Design a protein around this ligand. Structure first.
Ligand SMILES: [Cl-]
Ligand SMILES: [Cl-]
Ligand SMILES: [Cl-]
Ligand SMILES: [Cl-]
Ligand SMILES: [Mn+2]
Ligand SMILES: [Mn+2]
Ligand SMILES: [Mn+2]
Ligand SMILES: [Mn+2]
Lengths: 262, 262, 262, 262
């Protein structure tokens, strides 16, 4: 729809899905802020974005979402620059490959703080902004692991389940403040990580399309292919925008049919 | 989105949510067909639509969705008038107020056949068209009772849960045919049955807006209001279009926060 | 537990899971009634039971659970022979192998009436007895298809999902009557239909145990084997007795780890 | 059943539910170990237990389940004393009263580590024991908040959702080691905490039975009363014992009908 009056903040929004989300936000004419830990990847995205949207209101800034303090400073900077945020998107981050046996206490704590505080901090910092905005909405990006765990990503599965449960609570708590809260459940989505996997394939005669196709078949994905970041982004936009004004405390499945549960 | 090359079919699409959906489809430039039992209401909706959309490719026909033979004939008429269908939407129909103690065998059978065959007939009949079209998608409108039952709608809840489960199965079976299958779960949405409850109110000073707001409060809806047909229609539009190309066998919550489950 | 003061009814309780349940009830000293369509199998089960349990208060009767009138008469016979019922168990029945594309309207209607009325009739008929008894509990045996459908059992899955949903409703409505209502969700359990699949095997050297083990592997059951009737019966016994006095409107998983949902 | 050959360890097992669980374990004739942080409450339980079961094999020991090191030492002590554990139960602990707004980063981290490591440590330490035992089973005590969050216990709800998701993963991972893993979902259960609440009531004319009754009504609990620790304990015993040999990666509802989801 038309988000020319929206101010949308995307935290962790330089990765595949986060980037795609910023692009669609700009397409809709929103003022957009985003932050990332890697200063390099952030500016490499800011560059390409300004190329495509010369007349965009954009504010990019390095930030560690785990550092409450920095998030406070970023949120303040966002307000001064673009005005009170009406939309907040928190990116999923990447999964951690480990069975229970392979996961130390150190890995557990890191994975937990990563998935939880990446949501808790931005939310807490921007909430006083969302509250004063109309059509306010938060979206916490998540994966199907939250409701359908996989054997090689035990810690991540469990953290993501927590965040999923948190989304429901925030939805209920923030309703009186006029803020909707939803998330999405991605399946397997194209990424640099998968491209590095493809690069190290044993079947060299297969191209990216055939390889990912075979991978999706081994992963028993009904749609028979990996998702595209822009497809995740499209569900996020739906949730972030007034298009879903009667939707809060829910999730949208973006896994290509992976969820066995009905 | 750009649905100009789509042919969309809406069964039971003459009332609130049905009509709103047809409108959004026409807005997206889709060719649209719809059917219902009440010819007068159907022709009345058709008229209004042709007013707003002079150059619309539109086909409206009376049809009883429980009658397999009428559904077959309707899908044939759509085919010869607008082309092969690429989008199919099956409306929710209305719920039945009855506890277990109140519901007879015949009421059970009526409710089950209503909810089930309203889906099975149009799907079984349009599938050959959907299967030959690109971006083919089916959306079965359902209610939150399918996963979170209510005491005074026992038969309806159970029936709706069946359909929800059917949606997953259809999604898995039709995926190899290039057809996506999803649904939505409406909460309380403004309807004629609510408008008649309104006209029976004791508090005459309350208007439609004040009344429905008070009802939503007593129903403990976080968003503090009933949904609008167009909000449901937008979620259907999302699921029906290429915007949700990686989403199948899922549902979207349109209940305004009523789902307690996380 | 001590069910010596209980009167338990088991509908469709002449086959594997049914019989095993009746046995466990007799073990707990309960008075027990059971009915089924196959009189020969019923009388055969009755005989064996009276062998093992000389002083048992037992009543077996042929009855078609789809026939409301026969169910009413059976509940009357139980009443006058053993006393008012305090426990009611409704067996799962067998599933139907068919995809959507294979299932006709009539097959749909048959499957829906089978799954639904096998529950509705005994419940509607025994409720007046259950309502007047202490520790009254109803258990509806169901399968994991109710929440996690399978491609070759579409109609059965949808039907079972309906019943699962009905169990929640009945639980809420009967609670003010002092009646608990739960169910179980069986995975693959050893049965006559598996024993006939076994006799059709190509690998003749495999015995029943080796074969079912290989089947469980191919079905990806974590526990690596089919369940046994008695395992299902124990969960039913748990839910049917005072041991689960604070549990109603729920289900117990008896699938050997097949449920992917968390 | 008969657990006279079982060695069962209960961590955090001195509180209401944990204590009740040890008693039933001893009733079944199991050798039992348990640990708690409070040395006082642990010995106050050890005392009463030895009074009731003079011929019991019991080993009680102060331990902080958050301290990996102590848990290692306790597990070792258990083996030397009673032999390899065949059963492991991890108690739920108490919920934390806070909305999202009322929860600091410090409270979040504490609540998370508390709920996660109270499971991760005992499991990791005893797994090499469970693996060598037949009929091995773990039970992680949990609350309905894990799947149905409450507004005044946001952090706890989310942590419990994580643990619930973890139970499913452990179930799958440990299946090849012959170890089942399940949990329970308690509703509101009688406790000292509730007794202190009753003590501070405004309606002094109400006794414990009337007060808890009214509280259950305000909490909309179908069964119209609080649960009893022994009732939670009974579901735990079912899961811990061979009675549930075909059940893994699942949960049993012990909430008196609180779960709205079907
Ligand atoms: Cl992930
Ligand atoms: Cl409805
Ligand atoms: Cl089945
Ligand atoms: Cl809790
Ligand atoms: Mn569910
Ligand atoms: Mn034709
Ligand atoms: Mn669920
Ligand atoms: Mn009588």
């Amino acid at each position: 729809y038309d988000l020319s009056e929206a101010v949308a903040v995307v935290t962790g929004g330089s990765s595949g899905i986060g980037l795609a989300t910023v692009e669609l936000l700009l397409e809709a004419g929103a003022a957009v802020a985003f932050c990332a830990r890697d200063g390099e990847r952030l500016r490499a995205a800011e560059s390409a974005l300004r190329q495509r949207f010369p007349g965009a209101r954009l504010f990019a800034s390095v930030c560690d979402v785990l550092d409450a303090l920095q998030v406070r400073a970023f949120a303040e900077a966002c307000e001064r620059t673009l005005g009170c945020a009406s939309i907040l998107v928190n990116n999923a981050g990447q999964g951690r490959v480990s069975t229970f046996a392979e996961t130390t206490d150190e890995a557990w704590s890191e994975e937990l703080q990563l998935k939880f505080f990446s949501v808790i901090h931005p939310v807490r910092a921007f909430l006083p902004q969302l509250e004063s905005r109309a059509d306010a909405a938060i979206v916490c990006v998540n994966s199907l692991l939250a409701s359908q765990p996989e054997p090689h990503m035990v810690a991540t599965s469990a953290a993501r389940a927590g965040v999923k449960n948190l989304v429901r609570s925030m939805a209920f708590e923030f309703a009186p403040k006029g803020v909707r809260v939803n998330g999405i459940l991605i399946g397997l989505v194209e990424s640099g990580q998968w491209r590095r996997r493809f690069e190290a394939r044993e079947e060299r005669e297969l191209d990216w399309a055939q390889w990912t196709a075979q991978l999706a078949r081994n992963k028993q994905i009904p749609l028979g292919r990996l998702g595209k970041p822009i497809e995740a982004a499209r569900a996020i936009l739906f949730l972030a925008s007034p298009l879903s004004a009667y939707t809060t405390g829910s999730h949208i499945d973006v896994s290509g049919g992976l969820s066995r549960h009905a």
